[PDB]
Amino acid sequence: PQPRKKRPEDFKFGKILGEGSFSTVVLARELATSREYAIKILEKRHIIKENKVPYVTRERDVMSRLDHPFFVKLYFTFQDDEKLYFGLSYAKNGELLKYIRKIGSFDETCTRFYTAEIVSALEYLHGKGIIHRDLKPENILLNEDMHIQITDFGTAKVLNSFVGTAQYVSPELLTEKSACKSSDLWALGCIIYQLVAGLPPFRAGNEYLIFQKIIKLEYDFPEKFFPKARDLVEKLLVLDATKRLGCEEMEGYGPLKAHPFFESVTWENLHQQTPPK
Numbered sequence: 001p002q003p004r005k006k007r008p009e010d011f012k013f014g015k016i017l018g019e020g021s022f023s024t025v026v027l028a029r030e031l032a033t034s035r036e037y038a039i040k041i042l043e044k045r046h047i048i049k050e051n052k053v054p055y056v057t058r059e060r061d062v063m064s065r066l067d068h069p070f071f072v073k074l075y076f077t078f079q080d081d082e083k084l085y086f087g088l089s090y091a092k093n094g095e096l097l098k099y100i101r102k103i104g105s106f107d108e109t110c111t112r113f114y115t116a117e118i119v120s121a122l123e124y125l126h127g128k129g130i131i132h133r134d135l136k137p138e139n140i141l142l143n144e145d146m147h148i149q150i151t152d153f154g155t156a157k158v159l160n161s162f163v164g165t166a167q168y169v170s171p172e173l174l175t176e177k178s179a180c181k182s183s184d185l186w187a188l189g190c191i192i193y194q195l196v197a198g199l200p201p202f203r204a205g206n207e208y209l210i211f212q213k214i215i216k217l218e219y220d221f222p223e224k225f226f227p228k229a230r231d232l233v234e235k236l237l238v239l240d241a242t243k244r245l246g247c248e249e250m251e252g253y254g255p256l257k258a259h260p261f262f263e264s265v266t267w268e269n270l271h272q273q274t275p276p277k
């Protein structure tokens with residue numbers, strides 16, 4: 001058995017957290033328990049009209065398979081005649097992009113801690129044969145205890161039809177049109193650069209100009225960029241996808257976690273550690 005299927009009437013919906021093209025995330029409090037959930041609401045007619053059923057289905061199926069603290073949890077689903085509802089963890093401290101903008105460049109201790117949690121999360125995800133394909137600060141949420149919770153899985157791939165946010169797109173996605181774990185590792189390199197520098201590495205006036213810089217590996221490190229972090233970024237932002245730290249061709253997550261930038265990191269229990277304030 002499982003809990004009774006929930007329904008709209010079981011909740012007091014509150015504010016809209018955000019709105020997308022095919023869905024809206026609304027904060028809702030379950031009446032019988034007082035628990036707060038971030039409920040993603042999708043209109044069936046619109047999903048069907050735009051051929052998004054594979055994506056919506058993928059979002060639900062991938063999230064159902066995840067069971068790790070660094071990922072948003074899918075607690076339940078239900079639907080009425082017009083909409084689909086996905087009950088998700090409500091990450092109280094919002095997204096990492098907000099935090100980066102709020103504080104600007106992170107010092108080395110904060111960069112290390114959050115980079116380690118993302119690496120640890122990717123190790124888990126890739127270990128299950130799942131690629132995110134749209135990893136960016138906006139999709140990395142912060143829970144009440146300031147640990148990360150990664151979300152946005154509709155565009156994930158379970159091991160060449162989707163391309164994520166321009167600034168985090170890998171060269172292989174612009175040249176060969178194919179999805180690999182290497183693309184998430186490239187995104188990781190961009191994110192580490194962004195935490196240290198305050199902005200992503202490839203920036204320009206429009207998407208075409210950004211893609212142009214990406215394929216030519218046209219970016220540079222600002223002064224004072226932590227040396228070990230720069231070395232790590234240089235080993236992730238590599239045009240040849242098979243040579244990025246973390247790839248099976250480079251012998252996996254072991255060598256990545258062993259990079260000097262992570263020397264003081266205890267990988268086994270990051271989630272029990274107190275995030276640096």
Ligand SMILES: NCCCn1cc(C2=C(c3c[nH]c4ccccc34)C(=O)NC2=O)c2ccccc21
Nearest residue numbers: 017018025038072088089090091138139151152
């Ligand atoms: N602008 C946030 C975009 C990322 N995002 C946040 C969320 C989530 C949350 C949100 C938390 N704050 C938000 C602001 C805008 C939109 C969504 C949220 C949340 O608490 N839990 C989530 O999974 C989300 C869910 C599915 C797909 C993308 C999502």
